[PDB]
Design an enzyme around this catalytic site. Structure first.
Site, mmCIF file in Angstrom:
data_model
loop_
_atom_site.group_PDB
_atom_site.id
_atom_site.type_symbol
_atom_site.label_atom_id
_atom_site.label_comp_id
_atom_site.label_asym_id
_atom_site.label_seq_id
_atom_site.Cartn_x
_atom_site.Cartn_y
_atom_site.Cartn_z
ATOM 1 N N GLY A 170 0.740 -1.244 0.000
ATOM 2 C CA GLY A 170 0.000 0.000 0.000
ATOM 3 C C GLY A 170 0.775 1.304 0.000
ATOM 4 N N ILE B 197 -0.302 6.217 4.215
ATOM 5 C CA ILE B 197 -0.049 5.841 5.596
ATOM 6 C C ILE B 197 1.143 4.892 5.648
ATOM 7 C CG2 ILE B 197 -0.935 4.380 7.467
ATOM 8 C CD1 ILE B 197 -3.626 5.771 7.148
ATOM 9 N N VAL C 30 -4.163 -8.142 -4.827
ATOM 10 C CA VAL C 30 -4.721 -9.080 -3.848
ATOM 11 C C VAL C 30 -6.051 -9.709 -4.281
ATOM 12 C CG1 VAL C 30 -3.477 -8.097 -1.895
ATOM 13 C CG2 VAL C 30 -5.792 -7.232 -2.464
ATOM 14 N N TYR D 214 -19.196 6.547 4.470
ATOM 15 C CA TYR D 214 -18.281 5.407 4.576
ATOM 16 C C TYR D 214 -18.955 4.111 4.155
ATOM 17 C CZ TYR D 214 -13.842 3.368 6.123
ATOM 18 O OH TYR D 214 -12.604 2.757 6.172
ATOM 19 N N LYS E 45 -14.535 -2.967 6.914
ATOM 20 C CA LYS E 45 -13.600 -2.716 8.015
ATOM 21 C C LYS E 45 -14.015 -3.447 9.295
ATOM 22 C CE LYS E 45 -10.499 0.059 6.162
ATOM 23 N NZ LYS E 45 -9.109 -0.401 5.834
ATOM 24 N N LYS F 98 -5.190 13.206 4.794
ATOM 25 C CA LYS F 98 -5.335 13.491 3.363
ATOM 26 C C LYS F 98 -4.405 12.633 2.481
ATOM 27 C CE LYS F 98 -6.459 15.436 -0.498
ATOM 28 N NZ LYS F 98 -6.972 14.275 -1.316
ATOM 29 N N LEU G 6 -4.233 9.696 -1.051
ATOM 30 C CA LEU G 6 -4.836 9.530 -2.373
ATOM 31 C C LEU G 6 -6.212 8.871 -2.271
ATOM 32 C CD1 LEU G 6 -1.774 8.695 -4.640
ATOM 33 C CD2 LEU G 6 -3.356 10.629 -4.839
HETATM 34 N N1 LIG Z 1 -6.312 8.034 4.845
HETATM 35 C C1 LIG Z 1 -7.180 7.905 5.944
HETATM 36 O O1 LIG Z 1 -7.766 8.857 6.392
HETATM 37 C C2 LIG Z 1 -7.368 6.562 6.585
HETATM 38 C C3 LIG Z 1 -7.930 6.519 7.843
HETATM 39 C C4 LIG Z 1 -8.102 5.258 8.449
HETATM 40 C C5 LIG Z 1 -7.701 4.116 7.752
HETATM 41 N N2 LIG Z 1 -7.173 4.182 6.538
HETATM 42 C C6 LIG Z 1 -6.745 2.945 5.867
HETATM 43 O O2 LIG Z 1 -5.319 2.930 5.713
HETATM 44 C C7 LIG Z 1 -5.029 2.078 4.620
HETATM 45 C C8 LIG Z 1 -4.197 2.842 3.654
HETATM 46 O O3 LIG Z 1 -4.865 3.865 2.924
HETATM 47 P P1 LIG Z 1 -4.176 5.245 2.661
HETATM 48 O O4 LIG Z 1 -4.857 6.279 3.465
HETATM 49 O O5 LIG Z 1 -2.684 5.168 3.051
HETATM 50 O O6 LIG Z 1 -4.398 5.667 1.179
HETATM 51 P P2 LIG Z 1 -3.471 5.153 -0.066
HETATM 52 O O7 LIG Z 1 -4.179 5.443 -1.313
HETATM 53 O O8 LIG Z 1 -2.182 5.823 -0.044
HETATM 54 O O9 LIG Z 1 -3.268 3.605 0.151
HETATM 55 C C9 LIG Z 1 -4.199 2.619 -0.413
HETATM 56 C C10 LIG Z 1 -3.575 1.499 -1.000
HETATM 57 O O10 LIG Z 1 -4.529 0.453 -1.330
HETATM 58 C C11 LIG Z 1 -3.861 -0.219 -2.349
HETATM 59 N N3 LIG Z 1 -4.706 -1.128 -3.078
HETATM 60 C C12 LIG Z 1 -5.948 -0.872 -3.587
HETATM 61 N N4 LIG Z 1 -6.387 -1.983 -4.237
HETATM 62 C C13 LIG Z 1 -5.414 -2.963 -4.148
HETATM 63 C C14 LIG Z 1 -5.284 -4.312 -4.613
HETATM 64 N N5 LIG Z 1 -6.339 -4.918 -5.359
HETATM 65 N N6 LIG Z 1 -4.152 -5.007 -4.341
HETATM 66 C C15 LIG Z 1 -3.157 -4.434 -3.616
HETATM 67 N N7 LIG Z 1 -3.239 -3.146 -3.167
HETATM 68 C C16 LIG Z 1 -4.345 -2.404 -3.412
HETATM 69 C C17 LIG Z 1 -3.431 0.922 -3.219
HETATM 70 O O11 LIG Z 1 -2.489 0.508 -4.111
HETATM 71 C C18 LIG Z 1 -2.894 1.858 -2.251
HETATM 72 O O12 LIG Z 1 -1.497 1.613 -2.138
HETATM 73 C C19 LIG Z 1 -6.310 1.688 4.023
HETATM 74 O O13 LIG Z 1 -6.675 0.446 4.502
HETATM 75 C C20 LIG Z 1 -7.266 2.645 4.515
HETATM 76 O O14 LIG Z 1 -8.488 2.092 4.574
HETATM 77 C C21 LIG Z 1 -6.984 5.386 5.928
HETATM 78 C C1 LIG Z 2 -16.373 8.662 5.052
HETATM 79 C C2 LIG Z 2 -16.005 9.840 5.877
HETATM 80 C C3 LIG Z 2 -14.706 9.768 6.592
HETATM 81 C C4 LIG Z 2 -13.608 8.875 5.991
HETATM 82 C C5 LIG Z 2 -12.125 9.372 6.188
HETATM 83 C C6 LIG Z 2 -11.043 8.337 6.596
HETATM 84 C C7 LIG Z 2 -10.560 7.348 5.567
HETATM 85 C C8 LIG Z 2 -10.738 5.978 5.798
HETATM 86 C C9 LIG Z 2 -10.310 5.081 4.879
HETATM 87 O O1 LIG Z 2 -10.493 3.704 5.111
HETATM 88 C C10 LIG Z 2 -9.685 5.531 3.699
HETATM 89 O O2 LIG Z 2 -9.217 4.596 2.734
HETATM 90 C C11 LIG Z 2 -10.183 4.101 1.810
HETATM 91 C C12 LIG Z 2 -11.486 4.558 1.821
HETATM 92 C C13 LIG Z 2 -12.410 4.042 0.891
HETATM 93 C C14 LIG Z 2 -12.017 3.080 -0.032
HETATM 94 C C15 LIG Z 2 -10.709 2.622 -0.050
HETATM 95 C C16 LIG Z 2 -9.783 3.134 0.881
HETATM 96 C C17 LIG Z 2 -8.348 2.645 0.882
HETATM 97 C C18 LIG Z 2 -9.504 6.893 3.474
HETATM 98 C C19 LIG Z 2 -9.940 7.792 4.395
HETATM 99 F F1 LIG Z 2 -9.761 9.118 4.161
#
Ligand SMILES: NC(=O)c1ccc[n+]([C@@H]2O[C@H](COP(=O)([O-])OP(=O)(O)OC[C@H]3O[C@@H](n4cnc5c(N)ncnc54)[C@H](O)[C@@H]3O)[C@@H](O)[C@H]2O)c1
Ligand SMILES: CCCCCCc1cc(O)c(Oc2ccccc2C)cc1F
Ligand SMILES: NC(=O)c1ccc[n+]([C@@H]2O[C@H](COP(=O)([O-])OP(=O)(O)OC[C@H]3O[C@@H](n4cnc5c(N)ncnc54)[C@H](O)[C@@H]3O)[C@@H](O)[C@H]2O)c1
Ligand SMILES: NC(=O)c1ccc[n+]([C@@H]2O[C@H](COP(=O)([O-])OP(=O)(O)OC[C@H]3O[C@@H](n4cnc5c(N)ncnc54)[C@H](O)[C@@H]3O)[C@@H](O)[C@H]2O)c1
Ligand SMILES: NC(=O)c1ccc[n+]([C@@H]2O[C@H](COP(=O)([O-])OP(=O)(O)OC[C@H]3O[C@@H](n4cnc5c(N)ncnc54)[C@H](O)[C@@H]3O)[C@@H](O)[C@H]2O)c1
Ligand SMILES: CCCCCCc1cc(O)c(Oc2ccccc2C)cc1F
Ligand SMILES: CCCCCCc1cc(O)c(Oc2ccccc2C)cc1F
Ligand SMILES: CCCCCCc1cc(O)c(Oc2ccccc2C)cc1F
Lengths: 257, 257, 257, 257
Positions: free
Chosen positions: B12, B19, B64, B155, B162, B192, B194
């Site tokens: 990821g 993250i 995956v 969400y 999740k 913030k 992608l």
């Molecule tokens: N950004 C947030 O606010 C936030 C908050 C809580 C949890 N999360 C979680 O953290 C994790 C990382 O997300 P992020 O915020 O770093 O954004 P990100 O876009 O940087 O990371 C998402 C990743 O999912 C990968 N991905 C999607 N489909 C895939 C597949 N079929 N096979 C392999 N990889 C795949 C993407 O390549 C990407 O690297 C996620 O599980 C997300 O749900 C994010």
């Molecule tokens: C829906 C309102 C608040 C959501 C913000 C927190 C958050 C949670 C996430 O699990 C996140 O990553 C994804 C969200 C939707 C689909 C796919 C991903 C990786 C990105 C993200 F900004």
């Protein structure tokens, strides 16, 4: 009774030990009108008898794996009832290996898919299909188990699916709530049903709950049935997005030490 | 550092806001050796640069959705590392409509299936495939969000996935624990990334967390990264089956009134 | 180390098996400067030796039943340290009968009062008294037990007090958070300390955790110590209002069946 | 009705907006026989009128700060009823400053003591005093609020006391459960009662719940009353150690963003 006039559709009434049977019996006692689903043409006679026991001839086939059958269920029901006040989702399935032994040994993509499709997705899918005919004060109820919240031996993939199911209760409650519709789950304790003849670590769990639950006894389908009738009724008009434990208090202890 | 000698595979890492990048940076600082996955041949150069930033040339493709790619990932990794000490699952996906607007409007069987397949199933699937090469003190980490626990607008289907993911943390912890392997999640606050450029109700959520969280500020990938490094390390040898909030305490309040 | 420069006051270091000793040892390793409290003039020599083991001569009396001693503690500490970066609250007490046998048999108003006064009130009381000298990035840590969340045999009145204590973590996090101060708890698994020589249903609980926890082992003060050091450090700057389990994952299972 | 023959003692019926009044009205409708407590000789006439509205002349003084009054309550009740089937604990108090503004500003040892004594201790204290005359199928109910689970502005010290109260529900359930007695709480949403004329951040909270709860409406004492009647009844014989939310689902969302 407290469900007088309410029209309620029950899924999952397979035998007279089914949780849905206890719910059916309680709803009927409190004045509800019932309708029932079944899966597979071979259960048509059996479900027809159950329905007649509850003063009903309204039985409909519905395999929740099939979008067309879900849509056809409500089209059929609508020719009898112009509105639906209650829905009981008492349906679950995982392949045998996915709920036996080690969690990873029984894990495959297909096993995961099937368990979540049938045990989790089907609840909001039925809700969506029912929506056009739901009354404003309708109430939707599903059945879950403590394995959603904590890891319980053998429950395995079903634990994941029930966790998704409990989340669906919350998202459904928000989606349907402005209309006035309520959505809840009962997290029931172990009860010897047909589904329980999967793994009998069940005997062990049953003994453990009897020995360690606050009430020192296992729950019955009558007790789950009455809690269910309550949730489906206007008595519970303040209650939505809730997962209510009906498990003799077992969830609230650390037992066995 | 507290991860000296530890060999950790990160999924990821998409951009320098991911993250996983914060986790990668923290692990590298604390002495870990890193390897990385990517999806799609077009990201090969970008992930290769990130790996080199962290002193690594170990990059492997892994979608995956594909069993063969999951198996091939660990076969490839094994030609470099005879053992694996850490795994970061930082992967998620749902179709756009399934994480926008009303929960039921975006609900379809396929949307549900895909969201759960990619966001939930993939974690224990990677664990199972990695198992033969996991060290006894290995640590597996996934990323979740408060939408698993409570209903958050937009969400939607991802909340269900999740919830299943958090359950998988508990069942994995039991399956792998007798060997000595730990399994945890971080429930991260909004950052913030992608992925966050899906729905920008994100701006609204970001503002709300800053205004209402106990620390009155949003979390950073450095903060999530450091918590992650901790969980992957022997500092956390007493901690497994845990979902740790790294969200400025937001989960613990009722805000906005 | 990750606590270099941090100045941390530890309560509750009674013996080399105390949880506070594990925390003290971990904090010292990571570069913190320590100071210590004690209760009763007879422990002055013993706590003085512990402090010297950790390169410290800073020891102060503090019976948390006494407002004047709480105020005097920080007045005394302030003559050495113009600021405080960490506070470890590792203090608890209930009368013997209130943590043995049946919950109601041991229940009296005075037993309830004392248990809550010493085990719950004292945490935010120390926080309030320390506040004028807390650094903006300070971190406050208390110790709790699963008996706060679920009913565990014998824990009884202490379960109530720990529930209030965990709530105090959340309210403290809000009160102190805008300044930047973090407040957390560790919910530690059973560890054979002096306090554990209250009721030995402890042997039973210890055996049960070893047999049923995901890691199939009891936690150590080193493991709780390291988790504690983490929470007190800037590594955990994103974490507040959290109750972190350091219990080999025991909280997350239904064991013993 | 579903409480026919049941004899239920209600505390806390202060005005016709009291939660206990809604509970009283629902219990009376379902066939229960009621008795009531009051505090202070000046409310004797008012509580006497309420009792007569519910077909009762059974009113008794009980300040729960006083052990002698608790004992005398049940001695008096016993001259009328040889057994007690239900007990409603709808009592709470904290000094004004302890539930206004900043949590630490209002924190003193005495404020803490009083809040926990009256709002938490009094529930198991009444249970213990009632025990010799409780029927085997008796049901004990207390009232809590979401501030026990999460930090809510202004609730402050009462949040700590309600957390202890919810823990007492679990320990009471274990103590009394082998006999067959059940113990539960309702976590009620905000309702404009006399107690609510403490801090009116209440108007703000009320507006927020109406805007953000799944049902998009505040709960009523009729809704809390009906849930209460259910819990006190044999319909709920499978339910103990539970904290049931009757709050329009508000607890289950993250609102306001
Ligand atoms: N950004 C947030 O606010 C936030 C908050 C809580 C949890 N999360 C979680 O953290 C994790 C990382 O997300 P992020 O915020 O770093 O954004 P990100 O876009 O940087 O990371 C998402 C990743 O999912 C990968 N991905 C999607 N489909 C895939 C597949 N079929 N096979 C392999 N990889 C795949 C993407 O390549 C990407 O690297 C996620 O599980 C997300 O749900 C994010
Ligand atoms: C829906 C309102 C608040 C959501 C913000 C927190 C958050 C949670 C996430 O699990 C996140 O990553 C994804 C969200 C939707 C689909 C796919 C991903 C990786 C990105 C993200 F900004
Ligand atoms: N029995 C217990 O101990 C227990 C405890 C907690 C929760 N639950 C849950 O209660 C619910 C009811 O189970 P039960 O105990 O009454 O056992 P049961 O066997 O009587 O009921 C299960 C039902 O699932 C239905 N079903 C399976 N696949 C289906 C499909 N593709 N389409 C439509 N229906 C399908 C079956 O027809 C059956 O009616 C389940 O969700 C179960 O998970 C049971
Ligand atoms: N040992 C376990 O299994 C375990 C598990 C979970 C949580 N805890 C908690 O960890 C904390 C530490 O306990 P421990 O296990 O290290 O045992 P311990 O006996 O070593 O520590 C207890 C401390 O409480 C202090 N104390 C008691 N009354 C006091 C007062 N009036 N003023 C100041 N200090 C007072 C004692 O001096 C002692 O230092 C406690 O809060 C305990 O509840 C312990
Ligand atoms: N009103 C709400 O929004 C709300 C929400 C959730 C929970 N609750 C809880 O419901 C319960 C009832 O409160 P309410 O809203 O009906 O307001 P209320 O003012 O009508 O009831 C409070 C009662 O506490 C009683 N009381 C106070 N001190 C007492 C003492 N020393 N001895 C005996 N009785 C004493 C009062 O006499 C009064 O009858 C309380 O526990 C409250 O915490 C209220
Ligand atoms: C795994 C140990 C304890 C499980 C007992 C409780 C229980 C929970 C259930 O969800 C249940 O119903 C199913 C279980 C597995 C697969 C399908 C169903 C309907 C049956 C059942 F007996
Ligand atoms: C009651 C059965 C399991 C309890 C074991 C875990 C435990 C928890 C504790 O909070 C603990 O410390 C105290 C216990 C009672 C009274 C005072 C203290 C400090 C000691 C201890 F061994
Ligand atoms: C603090 C903001 C939201 C609180 C509203 C819900 C509420 C909860 C209560 O527990 C309540 O009753 C009391 C509150 C403080 C002190 C005493 C009581 C009985 C009254 C009440 F309106």
């Amino acid at each position: 009774g407290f469900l007088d006039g309410k029209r309620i559709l029950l899924t999952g009434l397979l035998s007279n030990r089914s949780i849905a049977y206890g719910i059916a019996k309680a709803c009927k006692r409190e004045g509800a009108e019932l309708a029932f689903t079944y899966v597979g043409d071979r259960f048509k006679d059996r479900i027809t008898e159950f329905a007649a026991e509850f003063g009903s001839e309204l039985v409909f086939p519905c395999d929740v794996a099939d979008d067309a059958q879900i849509d056809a269920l409500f089209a059929s029901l609508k020719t009898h009832w112009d509105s639906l006040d209650g829905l009981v989702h008492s349906i679950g399935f995982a392949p045998r290996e996915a709920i036996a032994g080690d969690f990873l040994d029984g894990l495959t993509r297909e096993n995961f898919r099937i368990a979540h499709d049938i045990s989790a997705y089907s609840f909001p899918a039925l809700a969506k299909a029912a929506l056009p005919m739901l009354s404003d004060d309708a109430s939707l109820l599903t059945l879950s188990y403590l394995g959603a919240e904590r890891a319980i031996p053998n429950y395995n993939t079903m634990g994941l699916a029930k966790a998704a199911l409990e989340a669906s209760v919350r998202y459904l409650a928000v989606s349907l709530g402005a209309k006035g519709v309520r959505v809840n789950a009962i997290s029931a304790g172990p009860i010897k049903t047909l589904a329980a003849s999967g793994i009998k670590s069940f005997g062990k769990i049953l003994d453990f709950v009897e020995s360690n639950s606050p009430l020192k006894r296992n729950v019955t389908i009558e007790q789950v049935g009455n809690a269910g009738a309550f949730l489906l009724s206007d008595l519970a008009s303040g209650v939505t997005a809730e997962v209510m434990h009906v498990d003799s208090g077992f969830n609230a202890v650390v037992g066995g030490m």
